[PDB]
């Protein structure tokens, strides 16, 4: 089963660059491409889709 772990700074100053890293651990070694994406939800608001990328191409 694919497992995802997120990491990054808990506090970032205003007008700076926020860097987040999500690592992927997959138990299957055969060649497979997933579609990864980032989704943020503000406190008390609905979810928002930031962006995504393929796991085998720069698209």
């Amino acid at each position: 089963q694919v497992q995802l772990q997120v990491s990054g700074p808990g506090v970032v100053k205003a007008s700076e660059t926020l860097s987040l890293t999500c690592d992927v651990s997959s138990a299957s070694n055969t060649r497979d491409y997933f579609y990864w994406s980032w989704v943020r939800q503000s406190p008390g608001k609905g979810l928002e889709w930031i962006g995504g990328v393929y796991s085998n191409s720069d698209t």
């Binding site: 089963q1 997959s26 138990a27 299957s28 070694n29």
Partner: protein, 441 residues
């Protein structure tokens, strides 16, 4: 007007039950993992959707294979070690009364004896401390095993600590794992997957209490080949563990004497300080709530209005009558009278202490004529374990009374392996099939 012809398909996903030899994989020890194929870093577990498979824990060949493998490994480990044939002699034994408590009166015997040396023509007068369960009076005493067979001393280097063992099938064979929770161990399983190897199963040897095992993910599980049959053992799996702290507080001193050319016998010289009985502590509240969960689960099988009581063990040998196990080399037998002693009505920091007796002459498997001597462990010893399950037996079974009596069980280590291999089965793949199709050669 059909015109259907045979077509051969190679590689169809078909399997059926089979018996094979599963080989070991692991990440000086009694369980030889040096010869096992190292486990893959990322095990492959493929879920079989739309697959319902019949499982049966009580007729699984994996349990028999694991039992035979464990006995073979034990024999291999004991093969290159000293044989205590000269140890069978007349012993002049006195009572150990130096700094001992009232509960330890007569348990230890200070025994002096003549013994061989490096040279065949020389003898040495030596002394040792022997547990009361190990010596039988002929002041004249002899080891208990002398009139049965010789004993092979356990080598001090090999460690008795269990190591996880993964069982893997060869090519052309598959291992099916039942992922369905709340599983009885017998019948259909709709949630089934296939694994190249089983999970790490530590070969823990224990009676009346499954230690360092696997926990149920939802609630306490009751399993039995025939629950209505009082002669069938009941396997109970806890959803949460119960911490048990087992300790021998004696500061045992090991002295090694030369008994021959390159042969050393490790005796217990003296206990440094006070002498007191080894014992096991278990939290009272945790045990009470676990017993309540077990009672509520058993009520589903034996009726909501029945009376459930936990009582003595029936009787027999010390291995079955008491909770037998090992704690870092020293072999403990603990009187589990305070645990299974209560009744339940269908309406703090203190802990329960179980006294324990240490033994050196041992018989792990149900065999006669093959014994082992456990060298003493230097100093105090303590261990912490997870009680994750129970082996129970139902007494009587008459319908005259509404009460049900459950007693601790054990003795057969096949049940211990069954509690871990209940969800696993082995099948052989059949890639050849014939089907009807309109295609023609």
């Amino acid at each position: 007007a059909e015109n259907l012809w045979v077509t051969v398909y190679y590689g169809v996903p078909v399997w059926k039950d089979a018996e094979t030899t599963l080989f070991c994989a692991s990440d000086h020890n009694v369980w030889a993992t040096h010869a096992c194929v190292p486990t893959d870093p990322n095990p492959q577990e493929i879920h079989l959707e739309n697959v319902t498979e019949e499982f049966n824990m009580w007729k699984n060949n994996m349990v028999e294979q694991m039992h035979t493998d464990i006995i073979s490994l034990w024999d291999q480990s004991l093969k290159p070690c000293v044989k205590l044939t000269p140890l069978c002699v007349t012993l002049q034994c006195t009572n150990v009364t130096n700094n001992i408590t009232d509960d330890m009166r007569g348990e230890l015997k200070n025994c002096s004896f003549n013994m061989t040396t490096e040279l065949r023509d020389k003898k040495q007068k030596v002394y040792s401390l022997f547990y009361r369960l190990d010596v039988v009076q002929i002041k004249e005493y002899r080891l208990i095993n002398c009139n049965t067979s010789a004993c092979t001393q356990a080598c001090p280097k090999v460690s008795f600590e269990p190591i996880p063992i993964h069982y893997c099938a060869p090519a052309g064979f598959a291992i099916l794992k039942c992922k369905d929770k709340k599983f009885n161990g017998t019948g259909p399983c709709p949630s089934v997957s296939t694994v190249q190897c089983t999970h790490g199963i530590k070969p823990v040897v224990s009676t009346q209490l499954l230690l360092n095992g696997s926990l149920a993910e939802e609630e306490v599980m009751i399993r039995s080949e025939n629950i209505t049959n009082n002669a069938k053992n009941i396997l109970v799996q806890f959803n949460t563990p119960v911490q048990i702290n087992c300790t021998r507080p004696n500061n045992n001193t090991r002295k090694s004497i030369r008994i021959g050319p390159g042969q050393a016998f490790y005796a217990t010289g003296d206990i440094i300080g006070d002498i007191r009985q080894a014992h096991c502590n278990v939290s009272k509240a945790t045990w009470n709530e676990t017993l309540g969960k077990v009672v509520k689960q058993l009520r589903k099988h034996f009726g909501n209005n029945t009376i459930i009581r936990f009582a003595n063990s029936s009787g027999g040998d010390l291995e079955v009558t008491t909770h037998s196990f090992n704690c870092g080399g020293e072999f403990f037998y603990c009187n589990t009278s305070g645990l299974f002693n209560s009744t339940w009505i269908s309406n703090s920091n203190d802990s329960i202490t179980l006294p324990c007796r240490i033994k050196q002459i041992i018989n792990m498997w149900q065999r006669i004529g093959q014994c082992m001597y456990a060298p003493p462990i230097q100093g105090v010893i303590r261990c912490v374990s997870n009680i994750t399950g129970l082996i129970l037996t139902r007494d009587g079974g008459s319908t005259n009374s509404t009460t049900e009596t459950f007693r601790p069980g054990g003795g057969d280590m096949r049940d211990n392996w069954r509690s871990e291999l209940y969800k696993y089965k082995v099948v052989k793949i059949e890639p050849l099939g014939v089907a009807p199709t309109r295609c023609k050669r």
